[PDB]
Amino acid sequence: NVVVKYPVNSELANYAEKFWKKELAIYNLSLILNKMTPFVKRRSESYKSSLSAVKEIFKNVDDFQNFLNSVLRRSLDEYRVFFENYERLFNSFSSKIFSMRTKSRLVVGLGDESVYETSIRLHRNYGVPYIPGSALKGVAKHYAFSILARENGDEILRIYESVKEDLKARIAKRDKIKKNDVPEDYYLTAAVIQELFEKKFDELGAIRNTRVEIGDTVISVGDIVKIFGTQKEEGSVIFFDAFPTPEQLKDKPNLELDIMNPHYQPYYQHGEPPGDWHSPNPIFFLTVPAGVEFTFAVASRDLDDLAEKAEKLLKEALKKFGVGAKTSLGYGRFDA
């Protein structure tokens, strides 16, 4: 009762429809997802090319998830050799490697622009979910920022009154008028700490003697800035991408669906009173389920002690801060 169309060129739409009808066997998940996106028309006169409308061509959500995971599993041998080479690359450097399972659902790259409006970070060649190293480095840096703000908030605020005044003036300039309201909350401390770590690293020389307790170890501010680097000095810790272990993909699914059902969406966007006359607009998106095991590795360029400190910081961040998208809802959390 649904009409499927394909905006790809002719002589290829037939093969795309064969792939989506399971008549043929596709092997690359990113290929079928992106380059062969179907446009589904329901009783409503509109070819909505969204996962909510894309799933309508299957029997149910379970069938869609099973099809996606079978397509993912069809490249298991290639992913296995790729992971073996990746582990060899890890061991080539003096990299410390640790494995972590997903405590809750994880979704990285949800904000990427795509036809589905809700994308997911999939490896181009093999079509498996992965965490880019940039995300890990950023989450570690932000966890360090949060720890510093929570512990040494008033101290750094007093030491850098000029910087906090500059930040308050900037906020007043952009955030409405707010001439001097500018509450000195934890968020302002985090902002000025980030500003110090990004544009005012040299002025952070005095603070470098400070130490903050992470997990069981103690990390200095100088250690953190050496690990991450500045505009004038390169970081010393190499953060590699994280990939799931190939073994677990054989038995449990590595990709599932999740739903967002925004009732009162006009209230949030347009300003209508919430009430209850606000029929929802469900939107589905892919996410790797909880329990999937990922392998992380951090290497060093100058000192292995910095690598160990960065590994501890990243473990703490993944345990508490969380990586990926919708981290405010407990998504993308890892457990030992």
Partner: protein, 345 residues
């Protein structure tokens, strides 16, 4: 002029961003490419720079194995330049001058260039196989007639340098010509029950030919041994496709990785004002071949272990075989890591 030539093969384990810095298209920070063709290449300057940095690190760490014997640069410099051995060492201690072996091979450091020229000359990392997604055979290694023609020209140059005509005709038995909708693909990529292939956006009729693909596989095997960067070479002979020139150009221009990155400000937890940018990356599992020519060293009073050109050839081959290097930017976030294999004819 030159004496010998080795072939360096680079297999991109992670996406590689050899930055160019020339303007900014919609995909910001474009990679360096050949202007007239658009094919992605790594210029000799960057490859020589990273090789020189790795060699300097190895020599300072005292890990370079010459003739299966460890190389200590201090005692060698003393045996060569005993009059000023201390002073030159101070320059290395102050980073003014690079260590002895790197200065012999890659030339003297920037602080002084008129003394001698480099004994080595790297080449541009011309692409050989491109990873393109496929319906069957999850991803495929793709090549173009210009690619194999340039490989044959490179082989001819190697034969001329070494005066070895025997290796000249290794690839000289491969002439091809393909329409824009035809390809010579391995059995894995070919669709079941249909003599057609799909390379990430296109349905291509499978042209029937075996000598060309067999010769290409044999050439790769001769260049890089029987181990093709962690997997046997014979295991990928059925995942190779030779496509039309325009199709290969389109693959190299549009199938490259486009990575979006943002900066998260702690004041709000959202992307900052203009904190987002896109970067172009070479896809993972790509092959780039380069020529490294070597002649007589231009220095004076050389040690006996590096006296002749072959003593440099073997040292470079043993020190840069199945190694891992970082090319381009985003080193700190695990980008640009490549497996390097050195071969000779």
């Amino acid at each position: 002029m030159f004496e010998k030539a080795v072939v360096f093969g680079l297999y991109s384990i992670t996406p590689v961003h050899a930055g160019s810095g020339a303007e900014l298209s919609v995909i910001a920070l474009p990679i360096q490419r050949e202007r007239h063709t658009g094919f992605p290449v790594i210029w000799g300057q960057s490859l020589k720079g990273v090789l020189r940095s790795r060699f300097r690190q190895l020599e300072l760490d005292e890990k370079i194995e010459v003739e299966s014997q460890k190389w200590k640069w201090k005692e060698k410099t003393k045996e060569v330049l005993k009059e000023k051995a201390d002073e030159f060492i101070k320059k290395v201690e102050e980073r003014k001058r690079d260590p002895l072996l790197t200065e012999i091979v890659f030339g003297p450091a920037t602080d002084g260039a008129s003394e001698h020229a480099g004994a080595v000359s790297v080449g541009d990392a011309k692409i050989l196989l491109f990873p393109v997604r496929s319906a069957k055979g999850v991803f495929a290694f793709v090549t173009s007639p210009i690619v194999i023609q340039r490989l044959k020209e490179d082989f001819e140059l190697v034969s001329e340098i070494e005066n070895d005509i025997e290796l000249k005709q290794i690839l000289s038995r491969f002439k091809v010509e393909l329409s824009n909708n035809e390809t010579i693909a391995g059995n894995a990529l070919i669709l079941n029950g249909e003599n057609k292939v799909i390379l990430e956006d296109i349905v291509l009729k499978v042209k029937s030919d075996s000598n060309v693909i067999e010769n290409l596989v044999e050439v790769l095997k001769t260049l890089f041994g029987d181990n093709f960067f962690g997997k046997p070479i014979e295991s990928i002979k059925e995942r190779i496709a030779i496509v039309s020139d325009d199709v290969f150009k389109s693959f190299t221009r549009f199938s490259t990785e486009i990575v979006a990155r943002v900066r998260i400000d702690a004041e709000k937890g959202t992307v900052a004002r203009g904190g987002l940018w896109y970067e172009e990356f070479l896809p993972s599992d790509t092959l780039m071949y380069s020529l490294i020519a070597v002649g007589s060293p231009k220095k004076e009073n050389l040690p006996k272990e590096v006296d002749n050109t072959q003593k440099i050839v073997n040292v470079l081959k043993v020190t840069f075989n199945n190694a891992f290097l970082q090319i381009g930017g985003d080193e700190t976030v695990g980008k640009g890591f490549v497996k390097v294999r050195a071969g000779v004819l």
